[PDB]
Amino acid sequence: RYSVQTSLIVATLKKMLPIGLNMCAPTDQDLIMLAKTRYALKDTDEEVREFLQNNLHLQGKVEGSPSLRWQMALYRGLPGREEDADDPEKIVRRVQEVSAVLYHLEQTEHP
Amino acid sequence: LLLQTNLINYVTSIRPNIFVGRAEGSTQYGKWYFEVMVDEVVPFLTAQATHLRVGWALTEGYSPYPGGGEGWGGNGVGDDLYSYGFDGLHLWTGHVARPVTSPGQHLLAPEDVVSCCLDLSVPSISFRINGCPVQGVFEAFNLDGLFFPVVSFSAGVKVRFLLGGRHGEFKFLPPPGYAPCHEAVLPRERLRLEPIKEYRREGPRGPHLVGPSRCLSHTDFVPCPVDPPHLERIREKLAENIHELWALTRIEQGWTYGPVRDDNKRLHPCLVNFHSLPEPERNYNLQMSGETLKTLLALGCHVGMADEKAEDNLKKTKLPKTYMMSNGYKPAPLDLSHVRLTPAQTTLVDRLAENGHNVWARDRVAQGWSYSARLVPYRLLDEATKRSNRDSLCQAVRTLLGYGYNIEPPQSRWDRVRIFRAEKSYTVQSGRWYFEFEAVTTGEMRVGWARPELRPDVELGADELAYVFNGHRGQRWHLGSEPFGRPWQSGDVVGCMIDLTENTIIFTLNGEVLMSDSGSETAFREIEIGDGFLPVCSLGPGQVGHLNLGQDVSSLRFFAICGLQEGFEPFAINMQRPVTTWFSKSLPQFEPVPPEHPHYEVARMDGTVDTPPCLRLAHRTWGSQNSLVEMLFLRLSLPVQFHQLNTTTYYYSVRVFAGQEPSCVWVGWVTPDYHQHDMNFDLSKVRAVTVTMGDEQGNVHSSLKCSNCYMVWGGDFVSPGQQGRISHTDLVIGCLVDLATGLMTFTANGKESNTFFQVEPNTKLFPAVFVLPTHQNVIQFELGKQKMPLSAAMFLSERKNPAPQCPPRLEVQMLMPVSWSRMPNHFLQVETRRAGERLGWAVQCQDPLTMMALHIPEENRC
Amino acid sequence: GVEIETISPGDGRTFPKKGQTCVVHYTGMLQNGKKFDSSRDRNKPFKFRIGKQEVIKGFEEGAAQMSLGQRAKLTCTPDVAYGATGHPGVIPPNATLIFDVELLNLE
């Protein structure tokens, strides 16, 4: 028999998903969720590029949640994850690509 | 009547590596002398004084536990009936201080020498002080087990445990014939001081969980001996071959034939030829050949005549001129190298060497007792003798195999699993959580999530409320046993995941998810929530584990799969306090019988106009569950009226239609004993607890058809084992009157003074037996003079209203061998930080620790 | 008929005079029961005078023949200590009282 589990690409994607945390901040996670729901709400890549800098208040304070301090601490104080100040051109396209690919995976999970 | 609380201090007990025990034969010398010396003492601090008693202990179920003890506070040495202690003023045997009249009634002053004399053969134990013999002797105490020099030092005291060594001298002269803990005591491990039954040993990373250690059990020091012209000729040839082999090796080493006996010249006179072989030499050679043949044929498989073709093959090796002796023999052995096989041959070699050493100890230790190093079989001596005997037997069996042959060889568990879980308030209903566990060795380990309502005395996996994953061979355990993945390695950590969104459990070992047979992320098939989830850890006997729940980033080690990569969070991210954990206690305590139990059923059956209502037992006739006997007693206690002519009352004398002689009286002053019910189930009747009496005394009645029962009071605390518990006493205290006459004796501290059940019957039990033990006789009113029942002196309100009433509070309680307990979150911060120096293993503690707890009036528990 | 078990360590050869004030550091202990009083728990020594009653007569006669720093087990008989009435709510009637008095006054 053949099914989704027989396909290799989905298994490889599921295996490589919990790898790219080095550039995945909780603010970046919120941006990814916003990009995913925008893609779901009838939008294309042009709208994502136009609205790539529209949102600015997503970078909330670290004291807003009882667990947000842990995420900020792990994202800041690690030798393998150093991100103090970076241009928006490289910290947005990757996030929106991750959001798009996870949205596609979720859509194809139950065809 | 009501519940009261008070502060108390924790008690600790250290234990050395010296093992002393008795058996049915050659076990030890039996005369050991030990001394303990105290440098610094601390006066009355906090609430009570510095509790410190010294004495011996036992390993037959004795296991002190900090925090929860017997009576008040922690279970110190001498509180129970399994250990003996002395604080220097009064003997402590059964949580009761025994007053003594000895010269020098003083406390443990600084710079004092304390010693005790222990006799293993003669049942007598006597203590000692700096300058006076301590009055008080023991008689007819427990012998089976292992004796340990235990101490009961509390928080804030320094003691030196000086037995022997570089600076281990005794200030006071030892009695003659007593071993001062020397002459090759445990020549396999270093002498170190360790706590008894450790379960929270510290580590460089975090606390380490330690399971029940496997000891040497008891009565195991004694050895275990065991019991054709062609065969005789083959044995003679093998004897000659091994003779010339050891002769040639001894000649090569530098030992030749001497005139008579040249010990200083390094000459061995036994190197003689077979032609001039001495008659005693031939005698013991044939004797050992016959013994070896008998041991070889003792197995169920004989040697067998397979081909017998290589017996006639003869070979020789190089014969240097220096190897020749004065006899003229030419010891040239044959060369063989095609006899290698499975190590079952090596196992047979080891077994034969063990049997030979056992029989040698049987025929050697039985006499002399002078210069034999005392002596133990091939389980505790040095490995040099074991290796020598092993090579001798392997070369012997090689010589036998080289001649064309083909030989091939044919109770209470106690140390059980220890379930570790958290409190029932830290439940999880929704959300992903991260769990870690570090392993040291590979054994009986089970790690995984489980239901909060975990049933005690239930194997992890053989239930619907456990989802742990067994650490032996890489198989899961949930309502059975199915293979899951790769087995563990030495060290590393163990990962355990959980998810509440879709109920999937993920197991990982080292940066990799454990693959299953199917080849996908195998889970436990969408576990329904029900109540919640809780991390449960297990530990087998002799295993060391490290439970890293995770309180900081440095605590986590691998965190490769999820944990932080996904929407997972560590279990203790923002818990400012260490997470409380509930371990599984091995102490057999009591609990009421649960209702609707499929095995046992107790119903309050009403009586008649002449018979008061009683309590019966209902059991299934079919043997659906037959594990062991039942341990039963009443609900409340029965105190003894102290003082008022007669200080002690309630003469103990059972009477079953006649006059018996129990001869078990004068148990003490108060003795809040219960009424035990010891029996089994044969005819679905067991026992019937009935109260029916109408005269000036009070007794209980039990009716049975065909079974065995024991109507003997179980005392305040009950700690039984198995095998029916027949004739298992603890001790008898012999008070000293400072003379050799004897004024009074102390025949008490009998937890279970039960005799045989066949005293009443002779051949069979055709009618019903009504045991009526009369133990209640306070007073009787002469106004009516009957013609007092029970539940009158036992309660606190119906004292002057004698009537056969059954209050709705007396319920039988079945003995749970396992009970749930919580260990404290803060242990001793020192715990012998020096770990024992060369000055005599000095141990000291500085930081005090206080703990306050309840005290149930009925059951002497904290 | 009162038994005293003096503990020899603790030195002291200054018997308490009549009319002066001395302190005690006792802890209460009921017979075949529990602890009801403890001066160590309050972290404050008890001050009382000798010869002006104001205490148990049995306790006074038990503590009379004692030296400085020498603790003992003063068992007070109930018929003269608290009588047949007793303290209403703390000490049960006709029960002996056991104390371990410790002396630390500097005089």
Side-chain angles (χ1 to χ4, degrees), chain B residues 829-830 835-848:
Chain B
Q829 290 105 349
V830 182
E837 59 248 32
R838 294 318 295 251
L839 280 164
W841 326 107
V843 64
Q844 53 101 33
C845 63
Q846 208 151 355
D847 286 311

PDB file of all heavy atoms in Angstrom, chain B residues 829-848, unseen atoms left out:
ATOM      1  N   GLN B 829      23.370  18.958  54.876  1.00  0.00           N
ATOM      2  CA  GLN B 829      24.243  19.649  53.937  1.00  0.00           C
ATOM      3  C   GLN B 829      25.693  19.194  54.019  1.00  0.00           C
ATOM      4  O   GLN B 829      26.472  19.507  53.112  1.00  0.00           O
ATOM      5  CB  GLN B 829      24.169  21.161  54.164  1.00  0.00           C
ATOM      6  CG  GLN B 829      22.849  21.788  53.743  1.00  0.00           C
ATOM      7  CD  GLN B 829      21.967  22.141  54.923  1.00  0.00           C
ATOM      8  OE1 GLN B 829      22.235  21.741  56.056  1.00  0.00           O
ATOM      9  NE2 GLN B 829      20.905  22.895  54.663  1.00  0.00           N
ATOM     10  N   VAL B 830      26.078  18.469  55.068  1.00  0.00           N
ATOM     11  CA  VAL B 830      27.452  17.995  55.193  1.00  0.00           C
ATOM     12  C   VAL B 830      27.532  16.560  54.693  1.00  0.00           C
ATOM     13  O   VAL B 830      28.208  16.280  53.696  1.00  0.00           O
ATOM     14  CB  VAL B 830      27.953  18.102  56.645  1.00  0.00           C
ATOM     15  CG1 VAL B 830      29.402  17.653  56.736  1.00  0.00           C
ATOM     16  CG2 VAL B 830      27.795  19.527  57.156  1.00  0.00           C
ATOM     17  N   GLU B 831      26.823  15.654  55.371  1.00  0.00           N
ATOM     18  CA  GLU B 831      26.757  14.237  55.008  1.00  0.00           C
ATOM     19  C   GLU B 831      28.152  13.633  54.854  1.00  0.00           C
ATOM     20  O   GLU B 831      28.476  13.005  53.842  1.00  0.00           O
ATOM     21  CB  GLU B 831      25.929  14.037  53.737  1.00  0.00           C
ATOM     22  N   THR B 832      28.986  13.844  55.877  1.00  0.00           N
ATOM     23  CA  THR B 832      30.379  13.392  55.900  1.00  0.00           C
ATOM     24  C   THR B 832      31.155  13.958  54.707  1.00  0.00           C
ATOM     25  O   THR B 832      31.609  13.231  53.821  1.00  0.00           O
ATOM     26  CB  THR B 832      30.471  11.862  55.947  1.00  0.00           C
ATOM     27  N   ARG B 833      31.285  15.288  54.699  1.00  0.00           N
ATOM     28  CA  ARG B 833      31.985  15.963  53.611  1.00  0.00           C
ATOM     29  C   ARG B 833      33.454  15.565  53.549  1.00  0.00           C
ATOM     30  O   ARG B 833      34.029  15.480  52.457  1.00  0.00           O
ATOM     31  CB  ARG B 833      31.851  17.479  53.761  1.00  0.00           C
ATOM     32  N   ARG B 834      34.080  15.321  54.704  1.00  0.00           N
ATOM     33  CA  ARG B 834      35.463  14.861  54.717  1.00  0.00           C
ATOM     34  C   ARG B 834      35.606  13.443  54.180  1.00  0.00           C
ATOM     35  O   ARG B 834      36.707  13.060  53.768  1.00  0.00           O
ATOM     36  CB  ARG B 834      36.031  14.939  56.135  1.00  0.00           C
ATOM     37  N   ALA B 835      34.526  12.660  54.192  1.00  0.00           N
ATOM     38  CA  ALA B 835      34.452  11.302  53.657  1.00  0.00           C
ATOM     39  C   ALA B 835      35.417  10.334  54.335  1.00  0.00           C
ATOM     40  O   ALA B 835      35.661   9.243  53.807  1.00  0.00           O
ATOM     41  CB  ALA B 835      34.676  11.280  52.138  1.00  0.00           C
ATOM     42  N   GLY B 836      35.973  10.700  55.486  1.00  0.00           N
ATOM     43  CA  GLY B 836      36.857   9.806  56.207  1.00  0.00           C
ATOM     44  C   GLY B 836      38.322  10.011  55.880  1.00  0.00           C
ATOM     45  O   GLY B 836      38.764   9.705  54.769  1.00  0.00           O
ATOM     46  N   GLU B 837      39.085  10.527  56.839  1.00  0.00           N
ATOM     47  CA  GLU B 837      40.514  10.727  56.661  1.00  0.00           C
ATOM     48  C   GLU B 837      41.271   9.536  57.248  1.00  0.00           C
ATOM     49  O   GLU B 837      40.682   8.524  57.635  1.00  0.00           O
ATOM     50  CB  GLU B 837      40.945  12.050  57.289  1.00  0.00           C
ATOM     51  CG  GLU B 837      40.664  12.157  58.779  1.00  0.00           C
ATOM     52  CD  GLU B 837      39.590  13.178  59.094  1.00  0.00           C
ATOM     53  OE1 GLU B 837      38.674  13.358  58.264  1.00  0.00           O
ATOM     54  OE2 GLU B 837      39.665  13.808  60.170  1.00  0.00           O
ATOM     55  N   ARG B 838      42.595   9.647  57.320  1.00  0.00           N
ATOM     56  CA  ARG B 838      43.437   8.581  57.847  1.00  0.00           C
ATOM     57  C   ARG B 838      43.591   8.638  59.360  1.00  0.00           C
ATOM     58  O   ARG B 838      44.303   7.803  59.928  1.00  0.00           O
ATOM     59  CB  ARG B 838      44.820   8.623  57.186  1.00  0.00           C
ATOM     60  CG  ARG B 838      44.810   8.305  55.697  1.00  0.00           C
ATOM     61  CD  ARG B 838      43.884   7.138  55.380  1.00  0.00           C
ATOM     62  NE  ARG B 838      44.340   5.894  55.989  1.00  0.00           N
ATOM     63  CZ  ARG B 838      44.852   4.872  55.317  1.00  0.00           C
ATOM     64  NH1 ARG B 838      44.991   4.911  54.001  1.00  0.00           N
ATOM     65  NH2 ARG B 838      45.234   3.784  55.979  1.00  0.00           N
ATOM     66  N   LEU B 839      42.944   9.592  60.023  1.00  0.00           N
ATOM     67  CA  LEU B 839      42.979   9.691  61.475  1.00  0.00           C
ATOM     68  C   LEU B 839      41.919   8.832  62.149  1.00  0.00           C
ATOM     69  O   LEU B 839      41.823   8.846  63.381  1.00  0.00           O
ATOM     70  CB  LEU B 839      42.812  11.151  61.911  1.00  0.00           C
ATOM     71  CG  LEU B 839      44.068  12.022  61.838  1.00  0.00           C
ATOM     72  CD1 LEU B 839      43.705  13.497  61.900  1.00  0.00           C
ATOM     73  CD2 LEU B 839      45.038  11.655  62.951  1.00  0.00           C
ATOM     74  N   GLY B 840      41.127   8.087  61.381  1.00  0.00           N
ATOM     75  CA  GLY B 840      40.105   7.239  61.958  1.00  0.00           C
ATOM     76  C   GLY B 840      38.709   7.513  61.439  1.00  0.00           C
ATOM     77  O   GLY B 840      37.725   7.243  62.133  1.00  0.00           O
ATOM     78  N   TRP B 841      38.622   8.053  60.221  1.00  0.00           N
ATOM     79  CA  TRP B 841      37.353   8.340  59.548  1.00  0.00           C
ATOM     80  C   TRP B 841      36.470   9.253  60.402  1.00  0.00           C
ATOM     81  O   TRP B 841      35.354   8.905  60.792  1.00  0.00           O
ATOM     82  CB  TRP B 841      36.617   7.046  59.179  1.00  0.00           C
ATOM     83  CG  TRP B 841      37.525   5.913  58.814  1.00  0.00           C
ATOM     84  CD1 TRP B 841      37.800   4.809  59.566  1.00  0.00           C
ATOM     85  CD2 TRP B 841      38.274   5.769  57.601  1.00  0.00           C
ATOM     86  NE1 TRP B 841      38.676   3.987  58.898  1.00  0.00           N
ATOM     87  CE2 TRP B 841      38.982   4.554  57.689  1.00  0.00           C
ATOM     88  CE3 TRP B 841      38.416   6.551  56.450  1.00  0.00           C
ATOM     89  CZ2 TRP B 841      39.819   4.102  56.671  1.00  0.00           C
ATOM     90  CZ3 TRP B 841      39.247   6.100  55.441  1.00  0.00           C
ATOM     91  CH2 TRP B 841      39.938   4.888  55.558  1.00  0.00           C
ATOM     92  N   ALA B 842      37.000  10.439  60.692  1.00  0.00           N
ATOM     93  CA  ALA B 842      36.267  11.407  61.497  1.00  0.00           C
ATOM     94  C   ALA B 842      35.098  11.974  60.704  1.00  0.00           C
ATOM     95  O   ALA B 842      35.257  12.391  59.553  1.00  0.00           O
ATOM     96  CB  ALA B 842      37.196  12.529  61.954  1.00  0.00           C
ATOM     97  N   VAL B 843      33.920  11.992  61.325  1.00  0.00           N
ATOM     98  CA  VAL B 843      32.710  12.526  60.713  1.00  0.00           C
ATOM     99  C   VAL B 843      32.135  13.593  61.638  1.00  0.00           C
ATOM    100  O   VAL B 843      32.132  13.428  62.863  1.00  0.00           O
ATOM    101  CB  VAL B 843      31.679  11.417  60.408  1.00  0.00           C
ATOM    102  CG1 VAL B 843      31.181  10.744  61.679  1.00  0.00           C
ATOM    103  CG2 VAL B 843      30.510  11.980  59.614  1.00  0.00           C
ATOM    104  N   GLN B 844      31.706  14.708  61.054  1.00  0.00           N
ATOM    105  CA  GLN B 844      31.145  15.813  61.814  1.00  0.00           C
ATOM    106  C   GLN B 844      30.104  16.530  60.968  1.00  0.00           C
ATOM    107  O   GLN B 844      30.181  16.555  59.738  1.00  0.00           O
ATOM    108  CB  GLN B 844      32.235  16.796  62.265  1.00  0.00           C
ATOM    109  CG  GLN B 844      33.118  17.303  61.137  1.00  0.00           C
ATOM    110  CD  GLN B 844      32.736  18.694  60.675  1.00  0.00           C
ATOM    111  OE1 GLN B 844      32.280  19.520  61.467  1.00  0.00           O
ATOM    112  NE2 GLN B 844      32.920  18.963  59.388  1.00  0.00           N
ATOM    113  N   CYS B 845      29.122  17.115  61.650  1.00  0.00           N
ATOM    114  CA  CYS B 845      28.076  17.892  61.003  1.00  0.00           C
ATOM    115  C   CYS B 845      27.894  19.199  61.758  1.00  0.00           C
ATOM    116  O   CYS B 845      27.973  19.231  62.989  1.00  0.00           O
ATOM    117  CB  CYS B 845      26.756  17.112  60.941  1.00  0.00           C
ATOM    118  SG  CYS B 845      26.036  16.710  62.547  1.00  0.00           S
ATOM    119  N   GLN B 846      27.657  20.277  61.013  1.00  0.00           N
ATOM    120  CA  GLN B 846      27.573  21.614  61.585  1.00  0.00           C
ATOM    121  C   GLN B 846      26.192  22.233  61.436  1.00  0.00           C
ATOM    122  O   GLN B 846      25.659  22.787  62.405  1.00  0.00           O
ATOM    123  CB  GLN B 846      28.627  22.527  60.939  1.00  0.00           C
ATOM    124  CG  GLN B 846      29.099  23.664  61.829  1.00  0.00           C
ATOM    125  CD  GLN B 846      30.523  24.087  61.527  1.00  0.00           C
ATOM    126  OE1 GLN B 846      31.207  23.466  60.713  1.00  0.00           O
ATOM    127  NE2 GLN B 846      30.977  25.149  62.181  1.00  0.00           N
ATOM    128  N   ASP B 847      25.599  22.159  60.254  1.00  0.00           N
ATOM    129  CA  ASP B 847      24.320  22.815  60.008  1.00  0.00           C
ATOM    130  C   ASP B 847      23.182  22.027  60.647  1.00  0.00           C
ATOM    131  O   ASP B 847      23.017  20.840  60.341  1.00  0.00           O
ATOM    132  CB  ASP B 847      24.083  22.963  58.509  1.00  0.00           C
ATOM    133  CG  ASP B 847      24.948  24.040  57.887  1.00  0.00           C
ATOM    134  OD1 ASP B 847      24.987  25.162  58.433  1.00  0.00           O
ATOM    135  OD2 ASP B 847      25.589  23.765  56.851  1.00  0.00           O
ATOM    136  N   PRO B 848      22.388  22.630  61.523  1.00  0.00           N
ATOM    137  CA  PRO B 848      21.236  21.926  62.094  1.00  0.00           C
ATOM    138  C   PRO B 848      20.074  21.888  61.108  1.00  0.00           C
ATOM    139  O   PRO B 848      20.086  22.532  60.058  1.00  0.00           O
ATOM    140  CB  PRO B 848      20.892  22.761  63.329  1.00  0.00           C
ATOM    141  CG  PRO B 848      21.326  24.141  62.969  1.00  0.00           C
ATOM    142  CD  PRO B 848      22.505  24.008  62.034  1.00  0.00           C
TER     143      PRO B 848
END
